[PDB]
Scaffold this active site. Structure first.
Site, PDB file in Angstrom:
ATOM      1  N   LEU A   1     -38.988  32.779  14.360  1.00 14.27           N
ATOM      2  CA  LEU A   1     -39.773  32.877  13.115  1.00 14.27           C
ATOM      3  C   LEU A   1     -41.122  32.176  13.341  1.00 14.27           C
ATOM      4  CD1 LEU A   1     -37.213  32.184  10.199  1.00 14.27           C
ATOM      5  CD2 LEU A   1     -37.564  34.188  11.675  1.00 14.27           C
ATOM      6  N   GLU A   2     -42.209  32.878  13.021  1.00 14.11           N
ATOM      7  CA  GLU A   2     -43.559  32.289  13.142  1.00 14.11           C
ATOM      8  C   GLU A   2     -44.258  32.132  11.799  1.00 14.11           C
ATOM      9  OE1 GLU A   2     -45.627  34.065  16.411  1.00 14.11           O
ATOM     10  OE2 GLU A   2     -43.875  33.789  17.717  1.00 14.11           O
ATOM     11  N   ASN A   3     -43.490  32.370  10.731  1.00 12.68           N
ATOM     12  CA  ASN A   3     -44.030  32.341   9.364  1.00 12.68           C
ATOM     13  C   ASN A   3     -43.431  31.191   8.571  1.00 12.68           C
ATOM     14  OD1 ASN A   3     -41.522  33.736   9.457  1.00 12.68           O
ATOM     15  ND2 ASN A   3     -41.926  34.763   7.485  1.00 12.68           N
TER      16      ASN A   3
END
Length: 293
Positions: A119-121
């Protein structure tokens, strides 16, 4: 081997890199992370849809068969959630349960060995820890669990990824941090380092190695080629030097770790497809080096 491992991301999409079936992935890769599961309209939930059309008509049946063949050869194949464009959120009990349920459903459908958290959010340690324990309860102790934080996520034990990793240390396989697409960062000595250097690898890996992760839980993630990332590519000799520096106190740059960590897991790359475009130079050299540790 699994003990000293190279993780590679295999693209479920065409971005201009060399298109590959799972069966095309080089033997050097011990863990193959399928990039990526898709978010759905249900909070926390994911699904996987093989990009048959974009991958030259590769069928679900052939993909499943290729996964089984990799496993028979001793490799692990896991599903990665997130990616640069991902919109998965795990920030409540309900979304934690939806994540565990849906990831396990995807694992069972395709025969995946586990999951990679990319996850990069955002990463909420309260709910991702709950989600991962729920998932572990379903899949059991053999589940492969990796994470691919950005550098900003592991600058201290307070980072969301770092806190999560520590909370689930007893079920965590390896943290393959992305030592790339990064601004300057602090190392474990409190000094500023820049991507694309041996010291960025060793000084930032040191924060993990001194911060409660076992050496087998730390992997060096790099771009496969200059085409694979906007910045942070290093020659394979640089990756191998960093591995030497951490494991056996040789080939260090200015940064010298206080200790040696011979059980350091290995390395990771984005992506097998970009590696293939570049003649498999990265996996040939880094794979040989890791499998000789």
């Amino acid at each position: 081997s699994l003990k000293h491992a190279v993780t590679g991301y295999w693209q479920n999409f065409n971005n201009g890199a060399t298109v590959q079936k799972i069966s095309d992935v080089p033997s050097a890769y011990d863990i193959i992370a399928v990039a990526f599961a898709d978010a759905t309209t249900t909070p926390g939930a994911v699904t996987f849809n093989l990009d048959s059309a974009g991958l030259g008509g590769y069928t679900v049946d052939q993909f499943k068969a290729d996964v089984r063949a990799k496993q028979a050869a001793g490799k692990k194949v896991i599903i990665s959630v997130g990616g640069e464009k991902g919109t998965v959120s795990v920030n409540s009990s309900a979304s934690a349960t939806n994540f565990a349920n849906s990831v396990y459903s995807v694992m069972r459908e395709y025969g995946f060995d586990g999951v990679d958290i990319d996850l990069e959010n955002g990463l909420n340690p309260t709910y991702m820890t709950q989600a991962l324990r729920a998932l572990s309860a379903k899949a059991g102790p053999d589940m492969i669990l990796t994470m691919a934080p950005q550098t900003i996520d592991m600058q201290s034990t307070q980072g969301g990824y770092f806190q999560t990793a520590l909370n689930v240390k007893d079920i965590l396989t390896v943290v393959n941090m992305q030592y790339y697409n990064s601004g300057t960062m602090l190392g474990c000595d409190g000094k500023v380092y820049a991507q694309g250097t041996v010291d960025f690898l060793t000084a930032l890996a040191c924060i993990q190695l001194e911060g409660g992760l076992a050496p087998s839980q730390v992997g060096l993630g790099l771009p496969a080629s200059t085409r694979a990332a906007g910045g942070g590519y290093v020659s394979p000799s640089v990756v191998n030097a960093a591995l030497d520096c951490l494991t056996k106190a040789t080939n260090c740059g200015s940064f010298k770790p206080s200790k040696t960590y011979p059980d350091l897991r290995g390395a990771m790359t984005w992506s097998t497809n970009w590696d293939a475009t570049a003649g498999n130079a990265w996996s040939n050299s880094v794979g040989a080096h890791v499998h000789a540790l």
